[PDB]
Design a binder for these strands. Structure first.
Ligand SMILES: [Zn+2]
Ligand SMILES: [Zn+2]
Lengths: 362, 98, 80, 94, 107, 98, 81, 95, 108, 362
DNA sequence: CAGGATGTATATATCTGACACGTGCCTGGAGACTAGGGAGTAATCCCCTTGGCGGTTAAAACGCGGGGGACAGCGCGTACGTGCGTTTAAGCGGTGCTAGAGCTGTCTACGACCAATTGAGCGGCCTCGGCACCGGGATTCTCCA
DNA sequence: TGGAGAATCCCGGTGCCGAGGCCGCTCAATTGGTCGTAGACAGCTCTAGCACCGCTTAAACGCACGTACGCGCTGTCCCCCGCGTTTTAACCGCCAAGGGGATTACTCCCTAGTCTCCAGGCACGTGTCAGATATATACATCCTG
């Protein structure tokens, strides 16, 4: 029933009112800090914040003791060396560079040492944190497995912020993305060309350890395109605003998202199925969704059982070819085990057949 | 008075559009008239395809605009703003063309 | 039959503007006319000599390409 | 009955290799064809003069690589040396 | 009883010809014999340089927000590099344009 | 006072004798020191005959004295008498060497 | 063996420029001259090293130097040519 | 072993006596002349190569030599060389 | 048989080697067949040119009141002619000297 | 007897006193005229008088109704084309001339048309003669066989002057003159080199008509060398002046010269044996004369019979190889017939055995 | 400064003609073999390059005066930027046509190639002649009156 | 105007050495005979150079307005140049030594060349889409007051 969905939606809205104050103090202090970064001499002179918006549909969020702000940094000519032949991760090397790139001491031979730059970046950020202490801020040293520099802030509550560096690249738009992002018929090739004219990112994240290089393996990142396609989801692109026929796409988005949030926080065996899964899932649903009539609050329940049906259909077929990378079928047993998926289907059936019992609470 | 523009200003926008543009600034007819005029000296009674003529216009325009930038920089080092013949002469001189 | 005055002064002005010029002395037009004339004489003399040993009555472009090449003025986009 | 050879085939091959997303005005096609040919002419005449200095009757890739080094700008030469050496050693193992 | 063709371009794992090239080599009146690895070496260096050019070409072109390749892009890219312009100084380009530039004293 | 010569005068007779002369004006020792100094960068441990060294001194002297006359004429067109670096820069510029 | 670049004595430069037909000699031009002279030398000697190396000699002849000038379009005579 | 080398100094001295037998000569300038002779011949030879290429010819004749020098040399000089060449070849046809 | 060996240069009435020239031609790796008069043609060309050279060379030399030859007067005669200088523009000469001239502006 | 030689010498001196006044008026008016030539625009802008001195030993003279003044005119690069393979006459052609020689209309193709320039020169000289008439001067038109422009002058007596153009040439010093002028042992190679460093002339004179070109055949001319070797005849070069031992060389020179003058004026069959014959004869006598003791007024008669003996020895041998041109044996029957030489020997014997009867007169 | 008018990037829609595929063909590249002779190396030798030790003398470096050429600045005058209306000649399309470049055959002189023998020029020794070179008188020279 | 050393040209003798002449000899030219073929005519077929003929239209020119750019000039002020002192260090010649390039033989390998099949590019033809044209909106600028 859509009324229970609106009440939990309003719960998310009240939580968003808490996150406004909290994350706004957070956004101002990292804006201050990043301002300090540009006057501080480094190889990170030009490193500015990558905004993705502030909404729950605009930042990937959890427990109030954690936050995330995306940072951008431009990069010169970069060759793309695949090690993850599924198509999800690459290596980090340059091109010719006649001028001479000022990171040779950071260059492991020809590869780029993500370890050294992350080390020195944590060094200079803690250096600057102890240089000026207007607001109560300190760097937290967590385990060297997740390269997200957490900054504990005692204003107003203990708000940590996962500082992560994303690299602005105009390099290639690789061959893995050739037959990626199909919007030719449903949306248009015109926009698609304009979109692929723009830059892109890669996130340094230590994947599965079947590799010589850990941390120096980097996953693809296109968050600008994701916020673009977020504000341009419907067949009429002027939607999510007052001028279009208001759908339930962001609605069902947050529903399934925080359903899975509550589901992993109450079933702690299943944690690998991160946020990107449902994102590529709804992308493929959309590319097979031709009609807008099946996306509206009147059809909210119909379209939501439709979404459940589509996702469970992808599970039984065991194929989820990625949107940007259809060669990379992210439904691979090597990273996400089968029996986990079976119990995941069982928890979906639990939520399904019992009138969604984890949302009678608030 | 109302929009009467100062010198160089108009020329600045012109130079902007020009260095942005690539096409030619020549009416090809008197140009190829002079082509056959120079040609007939050595030998008259010869035909030609227009492709070669356009190639001539291209290469000539290219060479002269290169000279334009060189003589421009020459007058720059000469600390002036208006052209003169002596810089052009010295340009040809330094390349050994005279 | 002169045609050298056919290169109109404002065309020359436009060309010089494309060459990046602020102010333009009024004497330089016949100067550049003569200099470009000399240049064309060199090129056309080479191309005619080519055309002669080519036993042709018409003139092609590839001879001109060889002329520019031998004058160290290497250009593409016209075949070859 | 006037088949002529060109390199637009291989140009388009290498093009789609590094960038399979681009059209071209065919002017540039012949530009690069003529270009690479002229380059190779410099190389061939050069290696000819070398083999003359070396009083040799044929040409291998050692003289080629040295003439390259003699003629090319900076680290590009070392790059191309790596490229050629590794591809020839690869090809010998075939 | 044939041994159906595996191209020497594929046998060196490249796009550029080896047969056509080697033909042009012998039919160039350079040498009577020509070593077999010399076309391989050649085709490799030239293909490498070719791709290097075409890389920056596509770079410029997409920066210019165009669909096909025009000379202007090529002239820009060539002159926006030392080693290219070092090795390609006196070449000239039809419809290539000039690098826009003005001395600060002219302002 | 008695025979203290004016500027340039002595230099005029010098220029007369110099343009009449052909020999070199260089002590060859520091020159070839710099030769091996530049040489060792690319590779050290190499010998040479003095003939090539004299050829180097010759060709270098020739190139620089050509530049001297070019920069001289450049300053002439610049309507001055003392040298400056900008003419030299523009000389290299017009030849495309910079 | 260091600071041989300052072995280029200023009066040598002065006499050289006198043969070059100049009249008054600004005090700054000597290090400019040294640098431009130096990069010219380097432009020669890189290819000269490459020459002798492909020539497999531990020594330097004059013919390589000649060929360097040739490829640089500065062809010289008087040493065999 | 001894490697008896080619030099045009014989023939240089021959033509020298053919015009100025009164005048003495050095050997440095002699090598200069020999070298320069070789250089211009190289220019003309590579030219004639590229030209016979442009006409797809397996052979090079005196007409091509004539056109090559004419394409290389300026004015009256070219005419005189044409005259000399034509004369001596026609002579040689009559032996 | 076995008549007296005779130079083809005598049959061209010139002072240049025809056998040596045609040999180096065939050692020059240019073509496949070589027109019989072409070496004679080129040789006659080269003879006329070197005559033109050594003429003015000795001219200049005697104008210096000299018997033997040095690169100075050679380079002078080069940089005095129009056609030859233009032909021999970028040529460099060991101890050739500079062609002396001074601008009237440099003069009082 | 030397006294009769001195009396006829003094007769020549009195005649020389007449020639002083006459030829001095002549020299001043042609100096005036030649001055007018330089301001008159022509291809003959620079045409100045070639002085050979004024003495009888310095100008070739005859009857007072004739005189001669040598004119010089510089010429550019000139190829020397021999037609007279004896070695006495050549053709008239230029060299390459990149600048462009301003005589193409006067150039018969490649040959030089001596006819046209001589025609136009006679034109401009008669033009100038009628332009200014200070002294009584007029041009005489004689037969077109001797290209000497005679100018009749009525001041004081009728003095004609044979205007002839000599061309100053720095061209070749031809191969005909290689083994010419041997002074290496008797005099010195040093001077010889210095002498051959200087220029030379060629006289346009229509030779024997076995030729296509008449008038355009030109004979060799070195009158500067002749006046040089005249003032430098002896082994001590300071002779003919007051500082050396006075010989009889100029003496015997004039003796034989005007002996032959009187001899042809009394025997009119023999006229081809012009002045140059005895000049080359005394040159060869000198190159075979090693001693100065046999050249002095005490040895005047001895040396004069010696000269007669040497010349008659050359006649019987029939060889007189020219001094500048030893290949050119000027004792050629084609220009000077044998029976003429025999009667010449007979007239020499006449003068010899009869105590020189043509000099008892005055 | 502010407005305002011009200049320019942005956005839509349209058409066309360039550009990517499709296909048949047959022209030159892989397969397989043999010749046979050019390049790689083995030993040797010889010459030549670098090291180095000791004078010498000319050149270079360093102090010093001076006037002069550069330069900062100041009036001026004109000619070159800025608009405008009139002529005009560049470009569009059509039509055509014909001379000339490409194709194909063929045959024919002609150069490539092998043998013997020769002499010429090239490596190396003798030699005189230009020819620096230092000395010593002749002749511009210019800064001073 | 001189003058007065200062450079700069002109004759003398002397080492000196090197340009040119002579001997041996070797390999490359010459002669003749062979053969395959390159081009030389010789016609036969499309195309594109000239040529015109109207027709439009923005470019050229001619005009006037004005200002600011070189030009000429004045003070002034370091900076090259002319001169002397020391130093310094480049040549002039020696010997060692070793090394490295030039030379021979032998072998090997690899391409030239033959012959066989195969597919690769090209000529041609179509379907579609990139941006020009035209229009219109919104901002960037300069210019005075
Ligand atoms: Zn919404
Ligand atoms: Zn006397």
């Amino acid at each position: 029933e859509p009324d229970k969905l609106k009440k939990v939606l309003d719960k998310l809205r009240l939580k968003r009112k808490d996150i406004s104050e909290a994350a706004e103090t957070v956004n101002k202090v990292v804006e201050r800090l990043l301002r300090r970064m540009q006057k501080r001499e480094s190889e990170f002179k030009g490193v500015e914040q990558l905004n993705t918006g502030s909404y729950y549909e605009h930042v990937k969020i959890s427990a109030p003791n954690e936050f995330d702000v995306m940072f951008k940094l431009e990069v010169p000519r970069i060759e793309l060396q695949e090690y993850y032949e599924t198509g999800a991760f690459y290596l980090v090397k340059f091109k010719r560079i006649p001028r001479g790139n000022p990171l040779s001491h950071f260059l492991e031979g020809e590869v780029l040492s993500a370890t050294k730059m992350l080390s020195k970046f944590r060094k200079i950020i803690k250096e600057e944190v102890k240089e000026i202490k207007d607001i109560d801020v300190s760097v937290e040293k967590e385990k060297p497995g997740s390269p997200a520099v957490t900054l504990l802030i005692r204003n107003p509550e203990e708000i940590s912020v996962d500082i992560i560096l994303a690299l602005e690249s105009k390099g290639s738009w690789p061959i893995s993305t050739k037959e990626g992002l199909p919007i030719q018929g449903w949306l248009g090739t015109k926009v698609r060309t304009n979109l692929r004219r723009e830059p892109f990112y890669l996130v340094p994240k230590n994947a599965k350890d079947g590799n010589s290089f850990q941390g120096e393996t980097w996953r693809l990142s296109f968050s600008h395109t994701e916020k673009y396609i977020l504000n341009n989801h419907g067949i009429e692109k002027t939607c999510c605003e007052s001028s279009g026929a208001k759908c339930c796409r962001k609605e069902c988005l947050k529903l399934m998202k925080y359903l899975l949030e509550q589901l992993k926080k109450e079933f702690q065996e299943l944690d690998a199925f991160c946020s990107y899964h449902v994102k590529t899932a709804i992308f493929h649903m959309w590319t097979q969704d031709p009609q807008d009539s099946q996306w509206d609050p009147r059809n909210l329940s119909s379209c939501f059982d439709k979404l459940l049906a589509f996702f469970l259909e992808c599970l039984r077929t065991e194929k989820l070819d990625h949107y940007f990378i259809p060669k990379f079928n992210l439904f691979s047993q090597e990273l996400i085990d089968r029996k986990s998926k079976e119990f995941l289907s069982k928890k979906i059936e639990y939520e399904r057949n019992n009138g969604f019992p984890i949302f009678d609470k608030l | 008075k109302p929009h009467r523009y100062r010198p160089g200003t108009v020329a600045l926008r012109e130079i902007r559009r020009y260095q942005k543009s690539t096409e030619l600034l020549i009416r090809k007819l008197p140009f190829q008239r002079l082509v056959r005029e120079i040609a007939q000296d050595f030998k008259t009674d010869l035909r030609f395809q227009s492709s070669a003529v356009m190639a001539l216009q291209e290469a000539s325009e290219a060479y002269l605009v290169g000279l334009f930038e060189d003589t421009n920089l020459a007058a720059i080092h000469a600390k002036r703003v208006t052209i003169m013949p002596k810089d052009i002469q010295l340009a040809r001189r330094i390349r050994g063309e005279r | 039959r002169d045609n050298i005055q056919g290169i109109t002064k404002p065309a020359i002005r436009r060309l010089a503007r494309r060459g990046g010029v602020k102010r333009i002395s009024g004497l330089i037009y016949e100067e550049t006319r003569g200099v470009l004339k000399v240049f064309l004489e060199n090129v056309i003399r080479d191309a005619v000599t080519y055309t002669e040993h080519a036993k042709r009555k018409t003139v092609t472009a590839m001879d001109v390409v060889y002329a520019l090449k031998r004058q160290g003025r290497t250009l593409y986009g016209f075949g070859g | 009955r006037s088949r002529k050879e060109s390199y637009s085939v291989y140009v388009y091959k290498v093009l789609k290799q590094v960038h399979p997303d681009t059209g071209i005005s065919s002017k540039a096609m012949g530009i690069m064809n003529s270009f690479v040919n002229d380059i190779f002419e410099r190389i061939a005449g050069e290696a000819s003069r070398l083999a003359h200095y070396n009083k040799r009757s044929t040409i291998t890739s050692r003289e080629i690589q040295t003439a390259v080094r003699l003629l090319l700008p900076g680290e590009l030469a070392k790059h191309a040396v790596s490229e050629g050496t590794k591809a020839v050693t690869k090809y010998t193992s075939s | 009883a044939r041994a159906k063709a595996k191209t020497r371009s594929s046998r060196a794992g490249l796009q550029f010809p080896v047969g056509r090239v080697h033909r042009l080599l012998r039919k160039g009146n350079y040498a009577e014999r020509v070593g077999a690895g010399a076309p391989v070496y050649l085709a490799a260096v030239l293909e490498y340089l070719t791709a290097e050019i075409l890389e920056l070409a596509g770079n410029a072109a997409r920066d210019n927000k165009k669909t096909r390749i025009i000379p202007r892009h090529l002239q820009l890219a060539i002159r926006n590099d030392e080693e290219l312009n070092k090795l390609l100084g006196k070449v000239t380009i039809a419809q290539g344009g000039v690098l826009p530039n003005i001395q600060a004293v002219l302002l």
